[PDB]
């Protein structure tokens, strides 16, 4: 699996690929690993699919509830703190996952949460077996000053590189942009494919 | 075991074979691995027989109840989400199974669920020891544009191939077609055998 | 890895893909897994690369020597018997490989040898992590009566299927045809790619 | 694997099936498990294929040599005693096999040798995963007074039963009759198939 | 232990032997392994004696209760489904047993249940260490068209074979015939012994 | 296995049964466990068949050689001392056997040797899984003043008892009497059977 | 430990010896292993002393209570069924014992119960480390037609044999006879000693 | 550690960093991991320092010897084949290393050799804990059409990325360029530092 | 990680670095390890991030509550005693952390608490993988008579040394000064950087 | 243990402490860990005392021999290369040591060698349990431009720090200075003690 989340001045870009393996056996080429979980919040999942999928549903429920009760969206750091507490509560029988939580409140944020509830904020983050390859691309090519279009291209490149070198990663690249203005928009497939061609790439 | 579920434009085809082994010892040649669990829903089971059989009964019960309470059938994705929650709830003392759930609601669907509750939708899926051989046949020969008759032939071929190379698979091939028009129809044995002959095959 | 060897009336076709992984990490996309080892003999390798590569060199050496000493090529069954003895001699400190040996003497032959020296002749055989998918395609689609052109297409399909579902397999498909008339000919890349297009496929 | 060897008044009938598995994966449907090793001597193999195949070759060599040196064939009990010594010599790094040795010297004989060199003579014997099923058929149906035709039918039945209940057994049934008069004759396939039909059976 | 249950057109025959061992030590030659548990229902037990004996008592109690509460006997499939649920409920602290359940409702039935609650119906079934030998005899000799007398003979033969080759099996053969007409009748010892003589056998 | 050796005033009686098991599976009902190894010397074997059979052959060879070289038979205590040295030499890679050695030199003797080369003389001794049952019979019923006919009856009883309670023991009882006057005489089967009837017994 | 229980036409004889060891260390030479637990019921204990002694007390209590509540003694088979249920209830934290339960209701009975609650009835039974020796003596010497005096002599002999060959057995032999006429009578020491002399024996 | 080797049209660029750690403890900041081993050949080392350093010395010695004996430099593929044989010879007591071998013969080459002797040629390759990060950068940024200056920049970037994300990597970046024209030239530190500034980077 | 806490006459200085690693993989370069937890109290964290972060939140909550309830701040020794009790309560399922707690009540204090609840006061203390390097610097360079400016410089040096030799440590140095006069003041980044330059250092 | 070796412009300073422990038990307070091994060469030892002491003797012997044979001292890098080869030769049965080798040839040098033969040159190095504390002091306080007197003071400080925090270090500090002008001079105890006072320190 490869997931990535980056922040720019007023945006958050999150992307994943879609491969699901049982060992070397590619059982599903189009699983879903990027989810909207609130108006301006997205989550990526890596690790044990069952544990991840349960957590996706809990977060959808818990944030929808919070928003009705409070009439404001949960702060992104509050979402991360909630996951932090849930995962740590069960550390000795853990959710075997790596989570990225990204969104906009008064500012853009990306948080990376591990299976023991450790949560750290960062300007960018990647998770899954393909993440080291993404970290390479991002160290070399990421700028804070990037435009949203430049960011979408950057993540497409990072995940394309990870797909080329991690057999546990593959399938269509899946991208969401999160802005105050339009909210959580999942880019359409035409558009992603189009940029894969314009950048000169594959899968 | 070999089970398979495929989707076509307005149909779902599900098939299994019937062998039950304790190690190399073929104890039963005609066990049942394909079950109707709702008006337009079917389930295939692989893995520990006892765990599977319990789950078949639960799902029959839980979907019948739902239907009476809601006056609509459970959405196929809802059935998968239910199984997802149930299996994950007990992940450390798991149901040692692989499940396929297929059916029609507003569209055709096939879902594959694992022993930790991970559920992924796909245009086709196979489970059991014989599944890799089925995946071979399907990669080469499946078309979205296939007719129901072509689909039935395709699954018969896939399962026949798996029977030839997986000693844990064998016995009569067992096929169900699910359409909005006729519901869950289990094909009769005359008819399956007839196509085994017309395609030129064995067991 | 995926390798395959098939026999037709007066020919042997052998093919592989080229991916080399250390776990999930795709380190090389164009390793070589198909080798000519005599005038009418080819070998495919799967398993530990170092052990395989040593064995390739030994066989080249041992068959060249034999041929000069005997003024006839080693019978294909003799090549298999030699490997059988070598691998079994060291079974407790084994060459961790699966070998296919194919060629023409008075008739076409394909032999499959394992890490303990077990050698079995067969009309077709496949090795490596992707082999079960190939076995699917071959069970469904192989005919003894196939022409060489049909055979080449068949193996391309089988390996393509395996590439789609085995993350340990990937890269350019690599094909050799062995006949009494032209000997061991390795098909050129233009030609393989051409048929990948004509059959409608990918990687 | 299923092998059997029976004795009648002036004959020895030996049979096997031909399936070769790596776990549940049927890699070869026509391996060879019955071999002539002297003028009036046959051997069946079960267990690790590499170890068995090496032993077949050693026995062929050692008995051909003995016969030239002595101008008489090795007594069947001498063959068994030789295997006994060889296998026991290497008991802590054993040949992981079960062997049946059958033949005629001054009388018919069947010997069963294990991986530690234990050798016992018996009026009939079976080896491999399918052997318990054969022992069932033979206990119920074997007579000392049987004719060679009756014996050939009996072993076909025994192996057919084992094939039906041992997934590690399958493929064509392979029969050799050993008489003073004609020596070691391997029955042709037409003839075996013919009796499968006449007895009303399958694979 | 060896138990067997077969079905004929309007009958069920169930038989066991009576040996109880602690390892190689034959502690009891006449234990009981065949029990009537309802008017037209019988059960055989194999595995841990304590667990089996407890289950025999539960089933007697539960079916007697059911019958009084419903005024009809529990369907044979219902008895198997009940056992299925019970055994699976406690799969991680299991009843270490193999059960056969046979009887007549609207038709004859035999069910085989394992220690994890897996239950499968079949035209015949055998359980215990001696079962593979029985499966040999039955594969070769069982007909659907057999008469009750022929059936009784067949099971006597099957168990006699198993007694000859399984040291964990021995003692008097014990037979029950279940018909709508006479109910569960346990054949007398005179009669079984008589047929052992007429068929020419031992223990 | 059950073997026994007893001494009387001018005689040694040695007996065994003939069952050979692989676990609970009775593979051979008439193996041989009593052997003449010199003019007035016999040996019984229990434990791993391969190791025993090799030792039988060595002792035959070594005692035949000794006798030619010395022109006297090896003293019975010498035979035990030789075995003692051989077995102890290889104690860390042992012959996994229990041996009884019995014979006449200037007096009758029975020696019991274990897998580490410990050898102890005794007026009687038993070996194998059935030995404790023999020791019961002998403690109760053995007299030093018994006649050879009484001795033969005693051992038949002891081994019959052991056969009844040790599933690892069974088959025809096999008896040898060793006197200065007639040497090592193996009793014939008619005669043993005859006494089994006269004493009122079974197998 | 050695305990025995035999049945005769209208009697039950039960006996034990009295040695208590911690490993090879004989800590007590006169422990008690035979107990009256009802008017016509006795129990022998083998295994862990603590567990056995607790069970003796429970059975005394539970049978005294039953008798007052029902005004009839618990049937001997009921006592065995009660122990069966108690021991099986705690099979994973078991009473590490072997129990014999003997007595008269409408007929004599002996039952043998193990640590998992398995209970089997038999005409005779023995328990403890010395039981195989007893089983030898009983197989050879027990008759159904024995008189009480003959029975008492037989059990003294059996336990004497066991004492001679099982270092975990020793001490005074302790005998109870149970009849309808005189109830549970424990034979006096003078009398047992007397018969030890008259039979010609030791300890 | 991070090492990298790339090929361009008439050049090979090889680079490493210099950190040596014992676990998390940075013991040396300037170890050497890039060595000239022939006129137009270089080697990088990763893995156990001791093993690597020994191999560097062997290769220097063996290639210097070869060159004097042949009067031509060892072909780069020959150097890789030599290492292949050496490392595989001792696979069960291995050199715990990853090697890159790069150079010019009639063309440029880079080979990657592992601890079991597996050697694969490639247009680029990276080794050590930091290699995945390098593989990211190279996938995204490497062109075959790059000039030597562009290449030098590319490897500086790749290693700088790896230094940023692999704590096992750090220290001065060390670069060698290999051309037919100037041979193996190790770039000076001024020049590397200069480009680190011009590209805008750190350590 | 490297954290340090020192005491001076009327001040406490606490510092950390910010690196977060998963093994050798630097996932985050600016995590937070120094937190204000009361008006005059600070806490540093080392060990498992999840466990630490939970404890930070608990202490913030528990000390805010205490302060409102008592109208005084919790004594620093009280905070350490509270942590001591909490961590020891769960010693067998521990918070896998090392904590420093520093502050002013009537005097300055630094306490070091371990994962089993052991708490010790000291004039200075360091925690994390880089602590031994800090202890070196402090032993050599710390004076009780240091001024706050000298203290700040000392800790910057200590942590810079640790960063140079512990790959688990890195990132911006983070410093807080705690006085009665100004409370807990976190120094600004300009100022820390400024001193790094003035002292002549790096990262 | 704590040893250190530093280089200055024309000098090498090496120092150790003298404590020898078996676990927590201080058996010797004045062991020797610094040795002259050639005219301008010194060695420090840490790790298993036996292994270290043997190596000291070998190096004295081997360098004395080399010097007589070559008439020049072994280059310091040659000494490190020799130890490298010796230690690596026996890596699987290793000398469990850490060695520092320091000296002057055409320039000053310090080398650090590990138990697997890895040798790295450095401007300074420390070994033993107390080395991390030394590395702290040296990172903060070492200058290339130091004078010999300043160096001697620096190492006294570093080892004093280590003594204060590593219970495995203690005893008199032991210092050698190596120059071209005066050779290897071991500083006298008066002088070291004197500087301990002048710097204001302890043990």
From Swiss-Prot, chains A, B, C, D, E, F, G, H, I, J:
The keyword DNA damage does not apply. Pfam families: Proteasome (PF00227). The keyword Hydrolase applies. One of its GO terms (biological process) is proteasomal protein catabolic process. Its EC number is 3.4.25.1. InterPro entries: Ntn_hydrolases_N, Pept_T1A_Psome_bsu_arc, Pept_T1A_subB, Proteasome_bsu_CS, Proteasome_sua/b, Proteasome_suB-type. Its main location: cytoplasm. Coiled coil: none annotated. Gene3D superfamilies: Glutamine Phosphoribosylpyrophosphate, subunit 1, domain 1. GO terms for molecular function: endopeptidase activity; threonine-type endopeptidase activity. The formation of the proteasomal ATPase PAN-20S proteasome complex, via the docking of the C-termini of PAN into the intersubunit pockets in the alpha-rings, triggers opening of the gate for substrate entry. Interconversion between the open-gate and close-gate conformations leads to a dynamic regulation of the 20S proteasome proteolysis activity. It catalyses: Cleavage of peptide bonds with very broad specificity. PROSITE patterns: PROTEASOME_BETA_1, PROTEASOME_BETA_2. GO terms for cellular component: cytoplasm; proteasome core complex, beta-subunit complex. Keywords: Autocatalytic cleavage, Cytoplasm, Hydrolase, Protease, Proteasome, Threonine protease, Zymogen. The active site is at 1 (nucleophile). It is found in: Cytoplasm. Component of the proteasome core, a large protease complex with broad specificity involved in protein degradation. The T.acidophilum proteasome is able to cleave oligopeptides after Tyr, Leu, Phe, and to a lesser extent after Glu and Arg. Thus, displays chymotrypsin-like activity and low level of caspase-like and trypsin-like activities. NCBIfam families: arc_protsome_B (TIGR03634). Belongs to the peptidase T1B family. The configuration of the closed gate contains an opening large enough to allow rapid entry of tetrapeptides but able to impede the entry of proteins and longer peptides. The 20S proteasome core is composed of 14 alpha and 14 beta subunits that assemble into four stacked heptameric rings, resulting in a barrel-shaped structure. The two inner rings, each composed of seven catalytic beta subunits, are sandwiched by two outer rings, each composed of seven alpha subunits. The catalytic chamber with the active sites is on the inside of the barrel. Has a gated structure, the ends of the cylinder being occluded by the N-termini of the alpha-subunits. Is capped at one or both ends by the proteasome regulatory ATPase, PAN. This is Proteasome subunit beta. The lineage of its organism: Archaea, Methanobacteriati, Thermoplasmatota, Thermoplasmata, Thermoplasmatales. The gene is psmB.
